[PDB]
Design a protein around this ligand. Structure first.
Ligand code: CL
Ligand code: MG
Ligand code: MG
Ligand code: MG
Lengths: 250, 196, 195, 226, 204, 231, 241, 243, 244
């Protein structure tokens, strides 16, 4: 046995293209649409819960994931690749930061760590690139609210608002017309729902849509009282009911 | 500690006191020294509490994995897994364990594993600091193929004396009965066994 | 080995080191040079456990000579001393530590200043006007505290050094068979052949 | 150090004193010995103070990652198992003596851990240099079916016994109550029976009392523009 | 033989109204022999100050180590490290050498740039954090410093009053310790100015 | 064809071509004969030279006082395998105070050659061996192939033109098996057997190589004028 | 065209080795079904013994992973047993480390993560199996979680796997569209097994004897398989109404 | 195409062609069988006499594992030996830790997992043998047959090699004509017959018969070779049936 | 076995070229142009962001210019993710040197170290090279202000003015024409922007499509200051130089 694939499976072609990365981006293009919008007092990330079967319980499949109490993530592309990246991203937030500095990492640095993992799968021996593009929303004391996109290559860019996957080109045009620097969080959620409706074919409701926010601190979700400086997580996943309430004022 | 396991007609019974010690201070007066490594394979622990707990947890893990692959293990098999840990780590352990179990084919069996890591299959076994004081009593009073009630009395009287003389032993007398009928827990308080 | 002294004057650094080497009962040699030139303007004296002293000194020498060739540039005395400290500070928590104390005398050609660094086997570094290791300081520091001036000439530094050695020869029980004295200045390193 | 844990009707309470010592010297007069492993799993530590926090945070970190992986709220037996196996591996050299308490979907729990990784179960427990003073109070006043108010009273009374009678313990009483179906309430400085009396004299000096050789502004700012 | 009292020395830190103060002696020795009167024990990384007592080689090593780590921190974070965060970094770094420790007694002092809140903290050689409101002490005359600070200290002292208090605490403690003295330094730290004062003291 | 690039690849008909190509190297090698009675076991080997100035390549290797082999194919591979046998014979003597059985020696050679046929990177051995020995169950003769197949025989031959000597032994089976207590006559039968494989060349004094082991006879090799007696 | 031999992306963003592993899944030509009751989770699977020389007791695609968790497999038996042994080892290790029984959904995730690794790392091939895990979880209640060669997994109200999965899937879909609930409203597991067998008979259009089926049942604190005679009793009750 | 050049590669069918090519090597080998009787198992194998120079009874093919398990195989003989060597290690570690001798089903999986592992990577070749094995444990007699893919099942009768179709047909008759069961001594006789009947596929060269057995009554549950008078009695019974 | 799928990234062509290095350079030629210009009183680093969007958060964005320490900075051309791996290694090397010698690392020593890492990927390991070219702008007390470049081959060279990325041929001609030795920073700022304005593939050069940085001794007395320009500051210097 032994892993005898110690050589790169991603290489430069004569034209200067890294084939496997391009092909990974093609896999992301086929994936279901997901988006993110940044407001003055928060950030929203959203996607469609494309259920593979009606017998499947789509609540058990989480497309939007908590990484830290103040950071969340959503994807487009290969779900399994996303799941393991979330596991690695959660662990690296502790090992390479929280166990050292006694606090959770800022959004940009956690994104940097995820990017590094995705870059290594683009150069290391005997592996293919990850077939996903991530959108990571988060808040921290010194940088405030922020939104980042991370690609198979490991490259990452900050956005005011953006979309990835199936109908990203049309969605990004829709967001350009609606986005301004004076948006409140509720306005950004409203725009997110309007944008996402365009790329969805079938049912459009709280049960087929997954949506989370990075907003105010939630002391009700902390689990304990007695420490004034601990005020609770800024990440909150909206319920099925909370989504439907905002679909009536749509 | 004062611990013992006794085979009888319908199976086997494990017995123990409830005192845990750090010097002369009784760190726990209501300790449970009778421990389950499988449905009907239990053990009695004496020596270092940390060592015997670590060993018992590993054995339980081994027998759970054995069961998933090969079905219910024998009491002999359980004793061998205990022995393997105690023998191969003799330099770093202080553990004296009695293994007791009930098969339907083999019925009640008892295996004692002293410090060295050796195995000894016996009709009954005694161990722990308090056992020294009841070698005479137990040898004179043990019979093979006793009834459940006789065996409970034998263990109750035996551990009562061990507790009376050994400062390291005390508290309640716990017992666990292993038969075809199932698993029964018993407890006996000082006011009961002291007046014996 | 035994006594190693150092003094920084106006325009140079002077290092004095004993000549004796003793194997328990007998004095095997009385002309031993307990020093190595690390670079054209940097000298290091040493004293500690037998074998480890020379092994360490030559190891440092090789590393500084390697740096000089690679960069075509002489490291500053401060830079060399920091490198030496790190090696000793690394050594103290090893399987078998280097039992070596050193003095580093150098002339910084950039700042046009002499510099003296004292480093013990633990990796304890201090920059000083005058320094020593072992029991040498116990006899000599009271004289240096009294007579030392920062604007001393090299000749005045040598005279103050003679007074120190005389006190050592009077009150120390061990016969260290005199000292070899070396001067470090802008022109490099030279030995005072009559002392 | 005095630390206790007491079970009650619908949960568990733990308490501790607030004195940490370097031999016979009091290093900190208001030390925090109640550590959080997870929102509803707290533990109190005695022995080597660095070890008790280090081992708590490591297990607490892994418990958080485990909770995220399994999509389930953490259990006390998970914290217990991870702590004992860690401590056993290091054969007692990590000097952490812990009382682990909490509530989870299984119910309320109370365990103690010793540095060698030995564990035990109980309705009332005490650890540290003042454990004998505390246990005396617990053995005198504990009963079955205690209320929340009774358990807090018993726990703090046991810590007080340690404070007053044990030289290793002192200052204040910290409490943490973990009730089933509720947020855990951390009551920092629940009792303050050791405030220092006003001094007889003010020791504020006249300005210019201290002899000074040199003054200088320290540049904490970065390299400037222009 | 005892590593923590070969070289000698002391550090003390205090809080005041919108300010903190940290001070140290200047002695380095080889047991009885005084070697240096210019061995400063207080360092700073941005606006966060760190005093370190104990074995001198480790004092130097740790300073170089935290300079290393705070520099990499600044490049990645694009901001200077804060006292609360730095305190956790010191604690982590010390505990990773649990069974082969640096023989030191670190002391952190500084003002949080965002909240403006004064902060101090102390550690044992193995990483345990002591974060007191009033004062922190460390070194071979820690007992003496505890005695001075406990009587001389009062809360909410103005910067120029706090200077007199911490200076008198250090000086009189150092004079009752054989392995401390040979000069002293005091840092007075406000939100955007820091003054450094060398004290005149007996040189025996 | 497409399935002979390495030893890890079966062909569509279930063949291992690299192993078969290794078998081919044996057929190119010089002839060697093995035969035994109930008391003794004999090896006869035709040595091959490069030219008239060169020496004749040695074909027989001693493994112990009671065991040894003759080779045909890649000689360096025979050195590796014979070295392994020397060690195994030796391990048996040191640890168990026991002479290694000839049958067990064959089993060890089979298993060593097998590992090289199932793993990537390596290659099969390119040599065939004839092991003779006398142990606690009398005389033995073994034939080793680098496929792993080891066979116990009364007599055999391997190498180029080995079919002629093998047929002769198949006829003489009943005669030479009975040659007990007569080493010279058993060698005569071996020399007459290997002669059925010769063409153009004949057996000379530096061409022939003989080895024998038996009841009270340690494994000894005869070369030079020591075999002139049998020419 | 070596992008079809190992697990790297094709120009279309596809992993052909993963797709071909899905096809190996149906090599056994066996269909399985899983449903949830109030207190139980039932899984049934077709049993086919084509050779008379076979010992029919040893022919099985249902595995007892732990006391609480059961697993049925769709695919070749070597890969099935490979997955079984691993799942058993993982469940045991989990209990030892974390002090409680591994949940069904967590095991499914763990095996799915292992499957994901085979789709990314080149030297390891995917297993040609679909793993259906069943239990009565102490927190979530009756549970069905299914894993495939792509590393995908999800919970199910009910599910079906095999060559004729679509027929079984639609049959189950139509039933839950009527009842408007996420389970079989039945007290005893015996009747939930009868529901499972009945709806498989309806979907496939075939009758079953006692040796044509294989049944597994999960209850609180244990998972067990039914004997041929336990199944016969089940078939008799179905025929009598 | 190219899917059959490397091991562990799925074809578009979902097949591992390299494993299927390993089966061809098994089909090319000599016939071997296994018969499960009332209180044990019987193994038998065809040994082709390539030449008169082969020493009779010496080149033994059937192998013992532990003291209670027998193994026989068809195909590449060295691969079979390698598998048995592993089997002996597996049985040794089982008895070391658990004291009791390895149960036959437990042993079957150990071999199965090991053979299956050689279909997971391109750095190894699949096994070129089908192995028939079994014995007696605490739960009675067991007979298994294991393929190159790692696939194994329990059997009443089993056969593999060049004459497997002929053998299988003969085994199927025994199962039908004896539902109550077959005795150990009967099975030895029947095993001899089936090998002789299966020798029609290898009729060019003559052969040597080799039989072994484990039986609770006849061998105390230990594996033993059939020798001397009992072997000759089985040969006579076999020769009588073909004529 | 596995040999079948090996691309063999570290081999020579018949002409004696390294295939992967050559193809990596081809990749870099499509990256946004980065320019470095060295003057007597400082260094300028200018670089073009690639076809941006109006919804990209520019003020918190960094794809071209990176800080290695207080004295040294780099301009990137190629795969950003690859560059960040190397940048972090370089930041550590600088700190290792500072810890060892208690002096800031000389610019050339840092450049040589990174370049040697790139070289290794072309000679051993069987991995693909880093698809990155750097421009190093730095200062030390030995050689003063210095400009270097390194490419995937691991070869590095010193420059007075240099460009990497797209349209380097056109850009290098324009720099060679207007560059003089006695030039100053303010003049070099203007040259860098004028060069990008003419070589750009975009319709017009605006503030949102640029990253800009200067290393000046224009810091109060004998010391060096790094200035990473803010979006508004790039907008101002574009108006000042008369491009917008
Ligand atoms: Cl996992
Ligand atoms: Mg007593
Ligand atoms: Mg003095
Ligand atoms: Mg793969």
């Amino acid at each position: 046995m032994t892993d005898r694939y110690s050589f790169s499976l991603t290489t430069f072609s004569p034209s200067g293209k890294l084939g496997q990365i391009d092909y990974a981006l093609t896999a992301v293009k086929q994936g279901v649409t997901s988006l993110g919008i940044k407001a003055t007092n928060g950030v929203v990330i959203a996607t469609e819960k494309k259920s593979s079967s009606p017998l499947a319980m789509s609540e058990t499949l989480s497309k939007v994931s908590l990484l830290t109490p103040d950071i969340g993530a959503v994807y487009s592309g290969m779900g399994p690749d996303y799941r393991v990246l979330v596991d690695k991203s959660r662990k690296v937030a502790h090992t390479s930061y929280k166990r050292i500095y006694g606090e959770y990492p800022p959004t940009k640095l956690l994104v940097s760590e995820v990017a590094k993992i995705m870059q290594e799968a683009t150069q290391s021996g005997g592996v293919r690139p990850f077939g996903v593009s991530l959108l990571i929303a988060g808040h921290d004391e010194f940088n405030g609210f922020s939104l980042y996109q991370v690609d198979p290559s490991g490259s990452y860019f900050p956005w005011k608002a953006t979309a990835i996957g199936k109908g990203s080109v049309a969605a990004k045009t829709f967001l350009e017309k609606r986005w301004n620097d004076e948006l409140e969080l509720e306005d950004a959620i409203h725009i997110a729902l309007l944008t996402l409706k365009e790329s969805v074919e079938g049912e459009f409701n709280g049960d087929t849509i997954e949506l989370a926010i990075i907003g105010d601190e939630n002391p009700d979700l902390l689990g304990y009282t007695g420490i004034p400086t601990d005020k609770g997580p800024r990440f909150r996943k909206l319920t099925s009911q909370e989504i439907n309430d905002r679909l009536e004022a749509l | 500690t004062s611990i013992m396991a006794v085979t009888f007609k319908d199976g086997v019974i494990l017995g123990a006191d409830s005192r845990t010690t750090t010097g002369a201070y009784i760190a726990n007066r209501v300790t449970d020294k009778l421990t389950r490594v499988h449905d009907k394979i239990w053990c009695c622990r004496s020596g270092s509490a940390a060592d015997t707990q670590a060993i018992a947890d590993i054995v339980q893990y081994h027998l759970e994995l054995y069961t998933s692959q090969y079905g219910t293990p024998s009491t002999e098999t359980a004793a061998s897994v205990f022995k393997e840990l105690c023998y191969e780590n003799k330099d770093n352990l202080t553990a004296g364990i009695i293994v007791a179990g009930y098969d339907d084919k083999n019925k009640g069996e008892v295996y004692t594993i002293p410090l060295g890591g050796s195995v000894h299959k016996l009709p009954y076994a005694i161990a722990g600091s308090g056992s020294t004081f009841i070698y005479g009593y137990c040898d004179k009073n043990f019979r093979e193929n006793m009834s459940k009630e006789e065996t409970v009395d034998f263990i109750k009287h035996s551990l009562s004396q061990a507790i009376k003389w050994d400062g390291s032993s005390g508290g309640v007398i716990r017992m666990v009965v292993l038969t075809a009928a199932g698993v029964e827990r018993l407890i006996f308080y000082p006011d009961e066994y002291e007046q014996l | 080995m035994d006594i190693i002294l150092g003094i920084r004057v106006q325009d140079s650094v002077i290092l004095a080191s004993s000549k004796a080497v003793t194997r328990g009962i007998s004095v095997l040699k009385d002309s031993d040079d307990k020093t190595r030139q690390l670079s054209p303007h940097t000298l290091m004296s040493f004293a500690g456990e037998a074998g480890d002293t020379v092994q360490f000194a030559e190891y440092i020498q090789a590393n500084i000579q390697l740096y000089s060739i690679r960069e075509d540039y002489e490291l500053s005395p401060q830079a060399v001393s920091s490198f030496v400290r790190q090696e000793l500070a690394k050594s103290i928590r090893s399987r078998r530590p280097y039992q070596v104390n050193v003095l580093i005398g150098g002339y910084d050609k950039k700042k046009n200043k002499p510099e003296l660094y004292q480093i013990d086997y633990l990796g304890t570094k201090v920059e000083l006007p005058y320094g020593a290791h072992g029991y040498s300081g116990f006899y000599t520091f009271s004289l240096l505290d009294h007579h030392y001036r920062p604007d001393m000439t090299t000749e005045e530094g040598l005279d103050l050094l003679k007074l120190c050695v005389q006190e050592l020869e009077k009150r120390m029980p061990m016969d260290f068979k005199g000292v070899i004295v070396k001067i470090v200045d802008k022109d490099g390193i030279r030995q005072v052949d009559d002392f | 150090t005095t630390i206790v844990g007491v079970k009650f009707n619908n949960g568990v309470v733990i308490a501790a004193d607030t004195r940490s010592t370097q031999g016979p010297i009091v290093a900190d007069k208001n030390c925090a010995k109640l550590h959080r492993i997870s929102p509803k799993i707290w533990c109190a530590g005695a022995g080597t103070a660095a070890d008790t926090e280090a081992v708590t945070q490591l297990i607490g970190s892994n418990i958080e990652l485990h909770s995220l992986y399994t999509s389930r709220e953490p259990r006390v037996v998970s914290a217990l198992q991870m702590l004992k196996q860690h401590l056993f591996k290091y054969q007692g050299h990590i000097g952490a003596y812990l009382i682990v308490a909490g509530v989870d979907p299984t119910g309320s729990h109370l365990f103690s851990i010793h540095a060698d990784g030995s564990t035990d179960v109980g309705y009332y427990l005490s650890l540290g240099s003042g454990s004998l003073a505390a246990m005396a109070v617990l053995e005198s006043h504990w009963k079955q079916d205690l209320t929340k108010e009774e358990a807090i009273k018993l726990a703090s009374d046991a810590i007080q016994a340690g404070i007053w009678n044990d030289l290793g313990s002192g200052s204040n009483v910290d409490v943490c109550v973990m009730e089933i179906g509720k947020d855990a309430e951390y009551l920092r400085n629940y009792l303050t029976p050791n405030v220092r009396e006003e001094k007889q004299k003010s020791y504020k000096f006249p300005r210019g009392t201290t002899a000074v050789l040199k003054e200088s502004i320290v540049n904490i700012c970065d390299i400037q523009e222009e | 033989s005892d590593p923590s009292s070969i070289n000698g020395g002391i550090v003390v830190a205090m809080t005041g109204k919108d300010c903190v103060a940290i001070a140290c002696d200047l002695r380095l020795g080889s047991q009885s022999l005084g070697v240096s009167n210019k061995f400063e024990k207080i360092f700073h990384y941005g606006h966060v100050f760190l005093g370190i007592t104990g074995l001198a080689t480790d004092v130097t090593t740790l300073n170089e180590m935290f300079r290393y780590k705070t520099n990499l921190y600044k490049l990645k974070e694009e901001r200077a490290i804060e006292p609360e965060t730095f305190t956790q970094l010191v604690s982590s770094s010390l505990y990773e050498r649990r069974f082969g420790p640096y023989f030191v007694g670190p002391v952190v002092a500084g003002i949080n740039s965002k909240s403006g809140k004064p902060f101090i903290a102390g550690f044992d050689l193995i990483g345990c954090i002591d974060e007191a409101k009033d004062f922190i002490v460390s070194g071979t005359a820690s007992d003496q410093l505890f005695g001075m600070c406990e009587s001389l200290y009062e809360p909410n002292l103005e910067p120029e009053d706090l200077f007199e208090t911490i200076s008198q605490a250090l000086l009189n403690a150092a004079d009752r310790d054989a392995l401390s003295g040979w000069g002293a330094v005091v840092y007075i730290i406000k939100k955007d100015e820091v003054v450094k004062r060398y004290l005149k003291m007996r040189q025996d | 064809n497409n399935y002979d690039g390495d030893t890890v690849t079966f062909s569509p008909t279930g063949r291992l071509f690299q192993v078969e190509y290794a078998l081919e190297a044996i057929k190119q090698g010089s002839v060697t004969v093995g035969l035994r009675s109930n008391t003794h076991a004999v090896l006869v080997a035709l040595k091959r030279n490069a030219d008239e100035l060169s020496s004749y390549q040695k074909k027989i290797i001693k493994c112990d006082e009671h065991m040894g082999l003759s080779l045909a194919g890649l000689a360096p591979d025979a050195r590796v395998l014979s070295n392994y046998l020397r060690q195994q014979c030796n391990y048996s003597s040191l640890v168990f105070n026991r002479k290694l059985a000839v049958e067990r020696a064959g089993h060890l050679l089979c298993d060593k050659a097998q590992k090289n046929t199932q793993s990537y990177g390596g290659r099969p051995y390119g040599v065939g061996l004839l092991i003779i020995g006398y142990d606690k169950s009398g005389a033995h003769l073994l034939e080793f192939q680098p496929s792993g197949n080891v066979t116990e025989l009364y007599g055999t031959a391997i190498g180029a033109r080995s079919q002629g000597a093998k047929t002769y032994l198949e006829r003489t089976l009943d005669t030479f098996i009975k040659i007990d207590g007569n080493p010279d006559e058993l060698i005569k039968a071996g020399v007459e057997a290997i002669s059925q494989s010769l063409r153009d060349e004949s057996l000379t004094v530096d061409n022939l190589s003989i080895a024998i082991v038996g009841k009270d006879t340690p494994f000894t090799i005869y070369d030079g004028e020591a075999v002139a007696k049998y020419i | 065209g070596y992008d079809r031999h190992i697990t790297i992306f094709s120009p279309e963003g596809r992993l052909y080795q993963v797709e071909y592993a899905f096809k190996a899944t149906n090599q056994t030509n066996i269909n399985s079904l899983a449903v949830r009751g109030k207190d139980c989770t039932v899984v049934i699977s077709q049993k086919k013994v084509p050779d008379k020389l076979l010992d029919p007791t040893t022919v099985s695609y249902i595995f007892c992973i732990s006391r609480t968790i059961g697993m049925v497999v769709n695919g070749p038996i070597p890969d099935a047993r490979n997955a079984a042994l691993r799942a058993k080892a993982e469940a045991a290790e989990f209990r030892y480390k974390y002090g409680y029984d591994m949940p069904c959904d967590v095991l499914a995730k763990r095996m799915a993560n292992l499957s994901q690794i085979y789709t990314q790392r080149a030297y390891m091939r995917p297993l040609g199996v679909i793993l259906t895990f069943v239990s009565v979880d102490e927190e979530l209640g009756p549970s069905i979680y299914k894993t495939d060669p792509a590393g995908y997994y999800v919970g199910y109200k009910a599910t079906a796997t095999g060559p004729k999965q679509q027929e079984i899937t639609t049959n189950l879909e139509n039933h839950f569209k009527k009842s408007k609930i996420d389970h079989i409203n039945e007290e005893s597991w015996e009747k939930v097994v009868e529901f499972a067998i009945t709806h498989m008979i309806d979907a496939l259009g075939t009758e079953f004897s006692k040796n044509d089926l294989e049944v597994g049942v999960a209850t609180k604190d244990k998972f067990f398989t039914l004997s041929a005679e336990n199944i016969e009793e089940r078939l008799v009750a179905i025929a009598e109404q | 195409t190219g899917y059959d050049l490397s091991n562990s590669v799925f074809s578009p069918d979902g097949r591992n062609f390299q494993v299927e090519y390993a089966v061809k090597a098994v089909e090319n080998g000599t016939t071997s069988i296994g018969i499960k009787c009332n209180d044990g198992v019987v193994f038998a194998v065809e040994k082709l006499i390539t030449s008169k120079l082969l020493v009779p009874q010496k080149n033994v093919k059937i192998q013992v594992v532990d003291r209670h398990i027998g193994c026989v195989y068809s195909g590449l003989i060295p691969d079979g030996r390698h598998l048995v060597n592993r089997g002996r290690e597996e049985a040794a570690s089982f008895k070391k830790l658990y004291k009791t001798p390895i149960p036959i089903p437990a042993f079957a999986d150990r071999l199965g997992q090991y053979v299956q592992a050689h279909t997971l990577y391109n750095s190894v070749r699949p096994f070129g043998v089908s192995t028939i094995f079994g014995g007696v444990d605490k739960n009675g007699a067991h007979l298994y047959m294991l393929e190159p893919s790692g696939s194994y099942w329990g059997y009443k009768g089993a056969a593999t090699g060049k004459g497997r179709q002929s053998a299988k047909a003969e085994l199927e008759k025994l199962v039908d004509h004896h539902p109550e069961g077959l005795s150990a001594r009967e099975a030895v006789k029947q095993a001899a017959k089936i090998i002789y009947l299966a020798h029609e596929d290898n009729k060019e060269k003559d052969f040597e018969l080799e039989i072994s057995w484990c039986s609770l009554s006849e061998t105390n549950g230990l594996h033993k070779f059939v020798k001397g008078d009992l072997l000759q009695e089985a040969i006579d019974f076999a020769q009588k049936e073909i004529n | 076995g596995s040999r079948r799928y090996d691309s063999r990234t570290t081999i020579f062509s018949p002409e004696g070229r390294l295939y992967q290095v050559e193809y990596a350079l081809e990749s870099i030629s499509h990256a946004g142009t980065a320019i470095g210009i060295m003057a007597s009183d400082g260094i300028v680093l200018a670089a073009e962001r690639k076809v941006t969007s109006t919804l990209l958060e520019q003020d918190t964005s960094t794809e071209k210019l990176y800080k290695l320490n207080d004295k040294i900075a780099v301009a990137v051309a190629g795969l950003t993710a690859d560059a960040e791996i190397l940048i972090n290694t370089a930041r550590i090397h600088a700190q290792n040197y500072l810890k060892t010698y208690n002096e800031d690392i000389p610019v050339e020593i840092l450049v040589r170290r990174l370049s040697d890492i790139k070289q290794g990927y072309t000679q051993h390991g069987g991995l693909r090279p880093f698809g990155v070219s750097f421009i190093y702008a730095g200062y030390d007390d030995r050689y003063g202000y210095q400009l270097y470049t390194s490419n995937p081959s691991g070869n590095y060279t010193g420059w007075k003015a240099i460009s990497v990325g797209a349209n380097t041929s056109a850009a290098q001609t324009l720099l060679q024409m207007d560059y003089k030795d006695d030039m100053k920073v303010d003049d070099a700022i203007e040259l860098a922007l004028k060069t990008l304005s003419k070589t750009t593939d975009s319709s017009a050069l605006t503030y949102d499509r640029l990253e800009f940085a200067t290393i000046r001794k224009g810091a109060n007395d004998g010391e060096v200051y790094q200035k990473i320009f803010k979006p508004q500051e790039i907008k101002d210097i574009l108006v000042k130089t008369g491009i917008t």
